Amino acid sequence: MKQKVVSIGDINVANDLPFVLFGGMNVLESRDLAMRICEHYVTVTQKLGIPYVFKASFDKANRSSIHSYRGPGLEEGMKIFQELKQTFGVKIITDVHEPSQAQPVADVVDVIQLPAFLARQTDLVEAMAKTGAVINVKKPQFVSPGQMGNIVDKFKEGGNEKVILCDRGANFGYDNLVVDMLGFSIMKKVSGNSPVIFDVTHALQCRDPFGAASGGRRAQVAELARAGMAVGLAGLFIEAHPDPEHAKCDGPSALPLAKLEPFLKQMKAIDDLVKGFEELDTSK
Numbered sequence: 683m684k685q686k687v688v689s690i691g692d693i694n695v696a697n698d699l700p701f702v703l704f705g706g707m708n709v710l711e712s713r714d715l716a717m718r719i720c721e722h723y724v725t726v727t728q729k730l731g732i733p734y735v736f737k738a739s740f741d742k743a744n745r746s747s748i749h750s751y752r753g754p755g756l757e758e759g760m761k762i763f764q765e766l767k768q769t770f771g772v773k774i775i776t777d778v779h780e781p782s783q784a785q786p787v788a789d790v791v792d793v794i795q796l797p798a799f800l801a802r803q804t805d806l807v808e809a810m811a812k813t814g815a816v817i818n819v820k821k822p823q824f825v826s827p828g829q830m831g832n833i834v835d836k837f838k839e840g841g842n843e844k845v846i847l848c849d850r851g852a853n854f855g856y857d858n859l860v861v862d863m864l865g866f867s868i869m870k871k872v873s874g875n876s877p878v879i880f881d882v883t884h885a886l887q888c889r890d891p892f893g894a895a896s897g898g899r900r901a902q903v904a905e906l907a908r909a910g911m912a913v914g915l916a917g918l919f920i921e922a923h924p925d926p927e928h929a930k931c932d933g934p935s936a937l938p939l940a941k942l943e944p945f946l947k948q949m950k951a952i953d954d955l956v957k958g959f960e961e962l963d964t965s966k
């Protein structure tokens with residue numbers, strides 16, 4: 683069949699419609715810190731005719747505590763969207779954490795998210811259901827692709843239907859992740875041909891590192907982000923920062939802000955012909 687299409691503005695994501703770019707950075711460090719990041723992405727998109735949605739997060743939840751750089755916080759967090767927002771009128775995306783706030787957030791932003799850890803959590807699947815917006819599903823590293831119909835079905839069961847599926851790799855042995863480029867279709871099928879998007883950033887982090895033959899970071903984001911692209915996805919997901927990030931030079935992994943352009947050009951040419959190629963198959 684053809685692929686379902688959740689429409690994010692003049693941007694329409696679809697497994698046959700060009701790899702939409704879902705850029706951003708990690709923890710929302712500073713109202714203007716971001717600009718460097720918005721502005722610099724914004725450009726490259728249009729220069730290369732890649733669509734753009736901006737990824738941004740406002741809270742802690744994950745890692746260091748009691749406050750340990752807990753993120754801008756809701757109240758003053760949402761404010762900062764509205765600036766990058768109109769400054770270039772942009773489609774943004776924020777992960778929520780606990781139900782209540784599944785309405786505030788769902789205002790200044792375009793593509794709300796449901797963090798891996800509360801994936802199969804129901805009451806947030808609902809608290810967003812009581813919204814009807816564009817949701818992004820963070821596919822847990824412990825779930826078989828085949829289990830994505832049990833996050834989607836129920837979303838629709840929540841009234842909300844406008845769903846998206848994001849893959850962050852899956853775990854492989856203690857502390858390490860991997861991706862099976864063969865898990866993208868399986869997710870397509872089990873999930874009403876919903877768009878399938880690759881979080882190239884979180885994904886390979888524990889991947890680059892498999893201690894011994896690694897033990898000091900190092901990066902290969904495009905190298906892996908081209909695999910996604912040559913299988914045929916809806917689009918990518920990446921986070922950047924000048925010198926890597928404050929929340930990615932220690933958190934997970936990231937991408938050099940101004941190295942970003944020829945990355946996409948790799949991802950545009952590669953995608954280019956793949957989204958071209960007239961549908962084939964080898965089950966006969």
Ligand SMILES: O=P(O)(O)CN(CC(O)O)C[C@@H](O)[C@@H](O)[C@H](O)[C@H](O)COP(=O)(O)O
Nearest residue numbers: 709744745751798799884928929932933934
């Ligand atoms: O399983 P998840 O992706 O929800 C959590 N992990 C998976 C991993 O590779 O350890 C991903 C990120 O959320 C985590 O790396 C980040 O470092 C954390 O959220 C924030 O870090 P920081 O800004 O320095 O306070």
